[PDB]
Design an enzyme around this catalytic site. Structure first.
Site, PDB file in Angstrom:
ATOM      1  N   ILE A 152       2.074   4.504  -8.148  1.00 58.11           N
ATOM      2  CA  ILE A 152       1.796   3.359  -9.198  1.00 58.11           C
ATOM      3  C   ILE A 152       0.505   3.311  -9.879  1.00 58.11           C
ATOM      4  CG2 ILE A 152       3.659   2.221  -8.197  1.00 58.11           C
ATOM      5  CD1 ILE A 152       1.694   0.261  -7.046  1.00 58.11           C
TER       6      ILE A 152
ATOM      7  N   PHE B  44     -12.365  -2.711  -2.444  1.00 57.89           N
ATOM      8  CA  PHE B  44     -13.702  -2.970  -1.759  1.00 57.89           C
ATOM      9  C   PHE B  44     -14.229  -1.390  -1.461  1.00 57.89           C
ATOM     10  CE2 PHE B  44     -13.569  -7.431  -0.442  1.00 57.89           C
ATOM     11  CZ  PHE B  44     -12.176  -7.706  -0.760  1.00 57.89           C
ATOM     12  N   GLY B  45     -13.870  -0.344  -2.310  1.00 60.84           N
ATOM     13  CA  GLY B  45     -14.669   0.952  -1.997  1.00 60.84           C
ATOM     14  C   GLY B  45     -16.004   0.836  -2.398  1.00 60.84           C
TER      15      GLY B  45
ATOM     16  N   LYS C  27      -2.839   3.721  -0.310  1.00 62.35           N
ATOM     17  CA  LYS C  27      -4.010   4.292  -1.169  1.00 62.35           C
ATOM     18  C   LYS C  27      -4.561   5.500  -0.472  1.00 62.35           C
ATOM     19  CE  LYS C  27      -8.484   2.322  -2.879  1.00 62.35           C
ATOM     20  NZ  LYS C  27      -9.466   1.221  -2.516  1.00 62.35           N
TER      21      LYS C  27
ATOM     22  N   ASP D 245     -17.554  -4.824  -7.336  1.00 63.95           N
ATOM     23  CA  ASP D 245     -16.799  -4.253  -8.581  1.00 63.95           C
ATOM     24  C   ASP D 245     -15.542  -5.098  -8.967  1.00 63.95           C
ATOM     25  OD1 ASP D 245     -15.988  -2.343 -10.477  1.00 63.95           O
ATOM     26  OD2 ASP D 245     -15.033  -1.016  -9.169  1.00 63.95           O
TER      27      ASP D 245
END
Length: 292
Positions: free
Chosen positions: A30, A162-163, A53, A143
């Site tokens: 997606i 939250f990477g 993910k 971010d």
């Protein structure tokens, strides 16, 4: 080669055992972000949908930031943060099975329709509630942008991606790393000053400009030039100030403050009169693609 295998082994000690292909069907892609792809998958036993993910260890700018996914999942779950269920090492990828936010991302609303201030105030209140709780525990997202804000079908707003996050504390009071997405980056961070949670507050100010104008400032500039512009210039202006109430304008002026000591905190912003405008999550629902 060696570095990759060594890292796979490290990650294996922190993720859950096994392989969620064993209980999931019908992976459909997606979207993509900075750190990998997102699919929906169907939980076989229940028929429910989850998001997965998938992040390739070999494609990260800073591969060690993949641990952020584990730290957040383990420790900083909350009502306005995407629920993370389990993580796994699947060949050369980290997979995180997480809540599916079927309403999609705030970017698709901001690019295709015009939000009113009831809606904008609802998004800002939800985001600020998440940040207040994160910042009080020393977590900086780094971010914040409309792409990182996801929605449920009934219009509840949740922080995701939250990477790039990091922690501050008494022993490490400030972060130094050049991280985020250029158009949303706080000026002190582009200037390479030690910085703190205040950077998410500036980024939120830029997302307010997205909500009003459809785009962050300098978006037609190459990213490198836009950063220089953010570093050197006065705070960026809305493209049309008549399209915001005096209240929203006063709110924005507490976010887009160049000096981070003078910028409002998330704690302070929760009390700001603009947020009295917030509608319930139902107010957001008609904005979503399945409804417009």
């Amino acid at each position: 080669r060696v570095s990759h295998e060594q890292f796979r082994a490290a990650l294996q000690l922190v993720v859950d055992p096994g392989d969620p292909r064993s209980y999931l069907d019908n992976f459909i892609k997606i979207g993509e972000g900075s750190t990998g792809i997102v699919c929906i998958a169907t939980v076989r036993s229940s028929g429910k949908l989850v998001a997965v993910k998938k992040m390739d260890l070999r494609k990260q700018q800073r591969r060690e930031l993949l641990f952020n996914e584990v730290v957040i999942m383990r420790d900083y779950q909350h009502e306005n943060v995407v629920e993370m269920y389990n993580s796994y090492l699947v060949g050369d990828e980290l997979w995180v099975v997480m809540e599916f936010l079927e309403g999609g991302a705030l970017t698709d609303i901001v690019t295709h329709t015009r939000m009113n201030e009831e809606q904008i105030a609802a998004v800002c209140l939800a985001v600020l509630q998440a940040l207040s709780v994160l910042h009080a525990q020393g977590v900086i997202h780094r971010d914040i942008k409309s792409d990182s804000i996801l929605l449920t079908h009934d219009g509840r707003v949740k922080l995701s991606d939250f990477g790039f996050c990091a922690q501050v504390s008494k022993e490490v009071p400030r972060r130094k790393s050049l991280v985020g997405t250029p158009y949303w980056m706080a000026p002190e961070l582009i200037s390479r000053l030690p910085y703190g949670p205040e950077v998410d507050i500036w980024s939120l100010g830029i997302m307010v400009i997205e909500m009003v104008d459809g785009e962050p400032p300098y978006f037609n500039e190459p990213p490198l030039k836009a950063m220089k512009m953010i570093r050197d210039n006065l705070p960026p202006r809305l493209k049309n100030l008549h399209k915001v109430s005096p209240s929203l304008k006063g709110f924005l002026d507490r976010l887009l403050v160049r000096d981070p000591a003078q910028r409002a905190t998330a704690a302070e912003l929760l009390k700001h009169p603009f947020l009295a405008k917030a509608g319930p999550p139902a107010s957001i629902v008609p904005l979503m693609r399945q409804n417009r």
